[PDB]
Amino acid sequence: IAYQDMVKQRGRAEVIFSDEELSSTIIPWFIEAMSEVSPFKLRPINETTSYIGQTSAIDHMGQPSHVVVYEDWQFAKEITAFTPVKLANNSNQRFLD
Amino acid sequence: GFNLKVKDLNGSARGLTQAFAIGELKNQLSVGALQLPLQFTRTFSASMTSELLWEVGKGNIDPVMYARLFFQYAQAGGALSVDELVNQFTEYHQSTACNPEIWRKLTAYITGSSNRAIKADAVGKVPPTAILEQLRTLAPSEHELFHHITTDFVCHVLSPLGFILPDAAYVYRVGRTATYPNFYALVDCVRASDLRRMLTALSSVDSKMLQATFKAKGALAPALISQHLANAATTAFERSRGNFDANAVVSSVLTILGRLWSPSTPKELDPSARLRNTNGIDQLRSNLALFIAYQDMVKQRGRAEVIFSDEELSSTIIPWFIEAMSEVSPFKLRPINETTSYIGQTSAIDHMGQPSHVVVYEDWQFAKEITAFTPVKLANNSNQRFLDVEPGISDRMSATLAPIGNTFAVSAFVKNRTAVYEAVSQRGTVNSNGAEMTLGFPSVVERDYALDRDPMVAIAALRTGIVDESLEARASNDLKRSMFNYYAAVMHYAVAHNPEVVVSEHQGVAAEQGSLYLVWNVRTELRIPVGYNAIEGGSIRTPEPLEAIAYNKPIQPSEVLQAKVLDLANHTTSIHIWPWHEASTEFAYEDAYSVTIRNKRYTAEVKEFELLGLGQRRERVRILKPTVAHAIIQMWYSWFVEDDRTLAAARRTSRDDAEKLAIDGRRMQNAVTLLRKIEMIGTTGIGASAVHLAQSRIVDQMAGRGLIDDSSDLHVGINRHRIRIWAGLAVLQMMGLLSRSEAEALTKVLGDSNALGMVV
């Protein structure tokens, strides 16, 4: 999907052409870059959609009249209410009681 | 790209006439027949194509380096003249170095107290950067140079090595310089060697015994050395005396060189054979730069006077004029054969044939890279910065730079220039107003783009030979300085190919004295369309260097004269910096493509960061002005516009029905070459990025307002060619290559003639 996005905005893709050699040896580190640092960490595609449900309405035969896709979410538990306290002026440093 | 009709110079280019230079603008022109000869072996020329980073040392107070930098500061951007730059330093140096209050203040600032004085074997080293931090508050000078030059004086006298930690890295940019020594530039050279002796006085055999006096027997009480250094720097100052007035030096040394060049050496005084024998005066009377400088001086001054310390003095004092010129100056002495090495010449022809079109050019190589940097301040109120060069912008533009170099190379320029001028059924002629001559000199134009001037205003002044008296001092002075660099460059090439020449006096207007001028001789073919001269015998005598150049034969240039990139990457990443700001530019660009589709107009806006395909935008980064590359393209531009201008008024003044069908020929013809060139650039890393952005935003605009189906028309022939030209003009603008003002006058040209072949 990232590819689709890029080519939509860029309209071309150009290469450093240091390959066939370079980026096969340097870099895989693109892999390392994506694996460790990022919030996006790699998952099996079966388990990425686990929270998604689907349900159909129906007619007599029948074809669906109404189909609803959802994410099962649980509400609550608490709503925290805090009062900020400044230790030193000019800074965002705070205790939150 | 300065184009001229060789026949009438007074009409075509007044600025390039020698008669102009010696100050006769009257209908009378210099008389081809007069007296005494001469041969030029050498001249003074500066360096082309050099971008260098110069570290300023631990110590050591390099007395030449500083005096050189002074020139580079006064040159690469205007600050007065290097003369005024010097007596500003002397005033500074007096206000600082002779003042004991100030010496007390900084000796106290290092350690330990303003009052109490302690030998203090405990006290450790101190950073030079910290001494400069103080100096910015103590002696608030505009030119931060001054703070270093005094600084590493103290680090020179402060090095038992205890108190000074010799750790800092500081660098300066030595860039392109105007090539040839204007009269007042000479005065500036003498004035810089005044600085050479000034500094070599500071670092001394007696500043070094300061190490050896207090080396015994060890560390001593500080309160002393404040009064000692103050007298130490004064002795260095009081010893270097103004002595000889630098103007009076140059005035009188050139004046006598004027006396032994001239065929009129009057009754009263002609040079002594003793001073005639003085070493180097042989290469002095044979120096070309010194001659055009004479012309310069006597044009402005109108007389030449002597210090009259001669006959003796200037045989003994000075040769030192030589010393000033030898070492300090960027103008270092060269053989006149090797000075014109980058200049070629090529002629078009008719059947027989005489040259129809003659092009003089400088071989220049483009590219390689274009650097983009973001300045980072270490300390406020100072121009001290690290410059982090951030690539991927530099690489991206440099990628688009390679194809511009191919399509705009000077080689392609001279190729496409010769083949245009031909007319139906040959034969010539003196008709069309004769044999045109065009000469590009990016070396000269680069100066104007470097000094943030319109090259076209200097160019205009050449043709007319008159300047607007209203505009401010620095403005005209930058113009005239540039206007000289043209004439200077001309007579260097002109003489380099015909060294045997004759000097002759002028009648005079008063007549008082007179100006010495130059005449050439050259042998050639029978019939001359070219500007009036005999030619009488297959050889011809001429005063004007253009006529002289027109008669030479095609030339192969010896050297490539490749312009080089400055290296920010390796150095500046770890180091502090020079006067960078006026030499760079804020990096931001906006442009917009508009078009009409089915009686409705859509417009897309585009920004610089979108063009390099990134987000969002970084405003802090800047681009180093690629002044040289711009000057090369100018040569192209200056042709297109200026030819179209004269060709338009040519068609109006042409009554003949047969002549006009020829004029409109050259017009549409080279106009499409301008089209094909730009259209090519419209396809590039940027060019394609631009067209893509523009087209996409229009369709996004077309989905909303109605139906999309009209977008099929964007892919039709004319619109496709339209959008491409725009991208091409936009990319050139978004690099240092096209002023919005000049590209506008280009668009007008492409539209003045319809200049669109549909071509199926």
UniProtKB/Swiss-Prot annotation, chain A:
It is found in: Virion. Homodimer. Associates with the polymerase complex. P1 is the major inner capsid (core) protein of the polyhedral procapsid, which is responsible for genomic replication and transcription. Forms a dodecahedral shell from 60 asymmetric dimers. Binds to RNA and may be involved in genomic packaging. This is Major inner protein P1. It comes from Pseudomonas phage phi6 (Bacteriophage phi-6). The gene is P1. The chain holds residues 292 to 388 of 769 of the full protein.
